[PDB]
């Protein structure tokens, strides 16, 4: 989980990085006991009992989303960000964690580091990175000539300033999911 809190610049929602977790001793006790984390919801089973559970593989994603959009990520639930950027599959047996970083990601003079996907033709697949800067959000006219009207760059700027409120403030977020078809371990 060292990379989970050691990335100075988190991945933007459209470009969500994927990391692989395996062959190690899990510390969900660290997750719900650290007490610095702002949010902790694990849909698959009660988070405390998860330490006993053993799985073949683990998958994790780190991205920064606004406080307003944190509610959007859920299995069977979405939002404008979830529909075109990142969303949760109907069966998720892991957890969703959020930690606010007001000082780290709200620099003075504007933040050009983070941008968010705004337009897609249809709902994207869960766990799908449409990182490609595909344009052509128009239809009647080819987008090649100009962004005259419907045509637009589907990537938009999420500028940040210290005055931004909690919903405006960037909240770092991670998601966890497991499957067995090598990750667990009792101790004491």
């Amino acid at each position, epitope marked *: 989980f060292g990379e989970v809190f050691n990335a100075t610049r988190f991945a933007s929602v459209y470009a969500w990085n994927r990391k692989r977790i395996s062959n190690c001793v899990a510390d969900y006790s660290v997750l719900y006991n650290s007490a610095s984390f702002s949010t902790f919801k694990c849909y698959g089973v009660s988070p405390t009992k998860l330490n006993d559970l053993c799985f073949t593989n683990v998958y994790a994603d780190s991205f920064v989303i606004r406080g307003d959009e944190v509610r959007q990520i859920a299995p069977g639930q979405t939002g404008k960000i979830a529909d075109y950027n990142y969303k949760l599959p109907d069966d998720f047996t892991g957890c969703v964690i959020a930690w606010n970083s007001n000082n780290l990601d709200s620099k003075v003079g*504007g933040n050009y580091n983070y941008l968010y996907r705004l337009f897609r033709k249809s709902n994207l697949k869960p766990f799908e990175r449409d990182i490609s800067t595909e344009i052509y959000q128009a239809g*009647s006219t080819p987008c090649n000539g*100009v*962004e*005259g*009207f*419907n045509c637009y760059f589907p990537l938009q*700027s999420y500028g940040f300033q210290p005055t931004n409120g909690v919903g405006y403030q960037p909240y770092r977020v991670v998601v966890l999911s497991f499957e067995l078809l090598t990750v667990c371990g009792p101790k004491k």
Partner: antibody
Amino acid sequence: VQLVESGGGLIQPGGSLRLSCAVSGFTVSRMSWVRQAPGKGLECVSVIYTGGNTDYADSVKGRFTISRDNSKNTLYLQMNSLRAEDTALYYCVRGSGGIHDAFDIWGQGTMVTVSS
Amino acid sequence: DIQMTQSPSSVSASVGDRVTITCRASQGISTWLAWYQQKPGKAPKVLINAASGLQSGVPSRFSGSGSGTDFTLTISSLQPEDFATYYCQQAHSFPPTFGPGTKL
């Protein structure tokens, strides 16, 4: 939030006028120019895009230079080919937005007269 | 420019009643209109999100369906803020062109 402009005034025809408007509350992205005739309805005309693509209506096609400054957040418009049809209230609005061509955050603008 | 007409071209004082805004297609406009509210001495603002796909970020009082030649919308009730000049804009193609407009 509030876009501020200067240089809107009566001028003799041919004079070169630079119109400056200030982006407020957001990182510089898009600016559009819309003109309203005094005691008459407004009419959309010249626009610029964040992509650097440019659209000018037949009223200002090839006659208006539209630009913004990322460093100073000051929008640059240079008056060229002064004509009776274009002169009137001038407004700097967001260039485009929404699902389709939507401008929402506006400023006071600079009403412009032309005469002797 | 574009050729369309907006009604009611003339508006008498509207008291305790629904107000209707209408315009007619020139480019086969479908869900391509943005409604406007303006106060004199102030910058004009959109009265709706234009509902190109769905109406949003607007009080439900102004709701209408624009497609084909029908671009009509209704206002729930008269208000001091609702006492406001209204206009329409061409949306599908360049240049966007404003409809005649009406004031209260």
